[model samples]
Target: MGHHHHHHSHMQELPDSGALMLVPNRQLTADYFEKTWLSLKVAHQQVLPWRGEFHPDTLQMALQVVNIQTIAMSRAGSRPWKAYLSAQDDTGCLFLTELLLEPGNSEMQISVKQNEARTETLNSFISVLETVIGTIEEIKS
Candidate 1:
């Protein structure tokens, strides 16, 4: 509930030049805040199923192919490799999403939630993710 630790939550324009946004150090909160789970995919609960299935690397690589990944979770040390990425559907409508996965927390499966309209764009986006990860469906936490 004490999330308002800072108030500089404006979207600063990305640099015109190719430079690191988080240059030196400064993590910006993404637009992805608590919206509901539009749906949940039974993505991961084990590290290895098809040898590389459910692996963080697997997810990372998949996201890279379609979306731009960013670090929204993780500390100076770390807990779980959580990420909030800017995703786009085939229609080019952009959205923000949060994805979390821990190496050992098998009980806590890979989950995702978005903070925008659940339009066909999100539907298309989830479809690709389902193919890459797991059964994308309505799952209860």
Candidate 2:
């Protein structure tokens, strides 16, 4: 008999408390976004379709990290924090998007068809993103 070996990447574990939860403030969020976006945009523009082309992958990775941490927080009954990132359209223009998945009634739907049913989840996520963005803008003034 031959044994098939499967190797799974180990997830980096985080503690249930003491970690800063939400984005510090709007300025921090905005400043980080602007700086990161500008740097990445300049660095990868030649390879990427445009600024937007990179958003999905970025958002996915951010969400994956946040999902892991938030799940832990939820299990510990700690406050769930917002996870935010950007997405781009076909033209490569970026727009901020966020997620705050907790133990909720909303159904998970990563697929295209089921995504429509997840409008509420998306909306909720956007609200958090908007708040972060707005807060950042305010701090700048």
Candidate 3:
């Protein structure tokens, strides 16, 4: 358990330069995203959800409603260069749909979709994830 704890800390260490391309390869970006997700998951597990609090289970349920499988990067245009980080489960879907402007210095818009049954709860959950992504962006700078 402690071993995995150290690994998580190591993975959180981003490049000093506030740029995702600092490693010069697609694999680096992929790895960075994977590690960031893992870090967020662990953090989610550590915190006990309060009444009406946003949590990973809520996000997963929301994802399931929208039929989203893997969390992958989708590029838009080349002129300004843009990429979107998107994912969904069986219950709902969420997307950070914005192109990278300053790499890690840009704020991407987060879009979420879920059933009206728990719309507010799921939306709150997705919002928390968005904040987590912002935290990941700040890991470098």
Better of 1 and 2 by lDDT: 1
**Highest TM-score scorer:** 1
Residue 51's lDDT within candidate 1 is 24
How high is the lDDT of residue 99 in model 2?
Answer: 39
Whole-model lDDT per candidate: 0.43, 0.33, 0.35
**Candidate 2 all-Cα RMSD:** 18.8
- In candidate 1, what are the lDDT values of residues 21-91, reduced to their tens digit? 21112222443233222333322222322222245554566556644454554432243556555544333
Q: Give the TM-score of candidate 3.
A: 0.28
TM-score of each: 0.41, 0.23, 0.28
The 10-residue segment of model 1 with minimum total lDDT is: 19-28
As for lDDT, the candidate ahead, 2 or 3, is 3
Q: Which residue pairs clash in candidate 1? A: none
- Ordered list by TM-score, greatest first: 1, 3, 2
> Residue by residue across 52-125, what tens digits does model 2's lDDT show?
11133334434444331111112222223234344432222333333343243322112111112234443443
lDDT of 1 at 85: 51
Identify the runs in model 1 with alpha carbons over 4 angstroms from their true place: 1-54, 71-79, 89-92, 102-118, 135-141
